[PDB]
Design a protein around this ligand. Structure first.
Ligand SMILES: Nc1nc2c(ncn2[C@@H]2O[C@@H]3COP(=O)(O)O[C@H]3[C@H]2O)c(=O)[nH]1
Ligand SMILES: [Ca+2]
Ligand SMILES: [Ca+2]
Ligand code: NA
Length: 150
């Protein structure tokens, strides 16, 4: 049933520390509106420099983050992310183009995709969550500065 499917997504999303304290009604909005995208080894989920207005939660598999830096022809490997982590918030919070590539590291990667309106009405409205992601993005900014991102 729909209710059971919803309960399953609820359990997973509550396991994502970012969403652990979100009010039930906002979590429900995410559950109703999320979409799921699958990727295989090497597929670019996000490309650096592109417009983007969606937020991703990694529901299965691993992805790597690459980014163009000074003195390097090719994007450099910054980190990998795994199930339970997230990405894509920076373009929304900063009102910017995508600031790094996100690349599937293995087959059958699955991301929960949340569009801009849902993000703003859920994650952008719960003050505690917005303030947190802002600290997160500011930290990303400092990291970019350190490695001299192009
Ligand atoms: N700028 C930046 N983005 C990062 C870093 N590590 C992970 N990311 C993620 O990569 C994403 C690329 O798209 P975004 O919308 O710019 O949001 C970014 C972050 O979620 C980092 O060190 N710097
Ligand atoms: Ca699931
Ligand atoms: Ca920028
Ligand atoms: Na994360």
């Amino acid at each position: 049933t729909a209710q059971a499917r919803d309960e399953q997504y609820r359990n997973f999303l509550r396991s994502v520390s970012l969403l652990k304290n979100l009010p039930e009604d906002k979590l429900t909005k995410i559950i109703d509106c999320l979409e799921v995208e699958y990727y295989d080894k090497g597929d670019y989920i996000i490309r650096e420099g592109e417009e983007g207005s969606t937020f991703f939660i990694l529901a299965k598999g691993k992805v790597k983050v690459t980014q163009s830096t000074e003195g390097h022809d090719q994007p450099q490997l910054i980190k990998t992310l795994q199930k339970g982590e997230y990405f894509g918030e920076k373009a929304l919070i900063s009102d910017d183009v995508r600031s790094a590539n996100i690349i599937a590291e293995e087959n059958d990667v699955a991301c929960l995709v949340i569009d801009r309106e849902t993000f703003n009405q859920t994650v952008g409205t719960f003050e505690e969550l917005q303030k947190y992601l802002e600290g997160y993005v500011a930290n990303l900014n400092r990291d970019d500065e350190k490695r001299h991102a192009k």
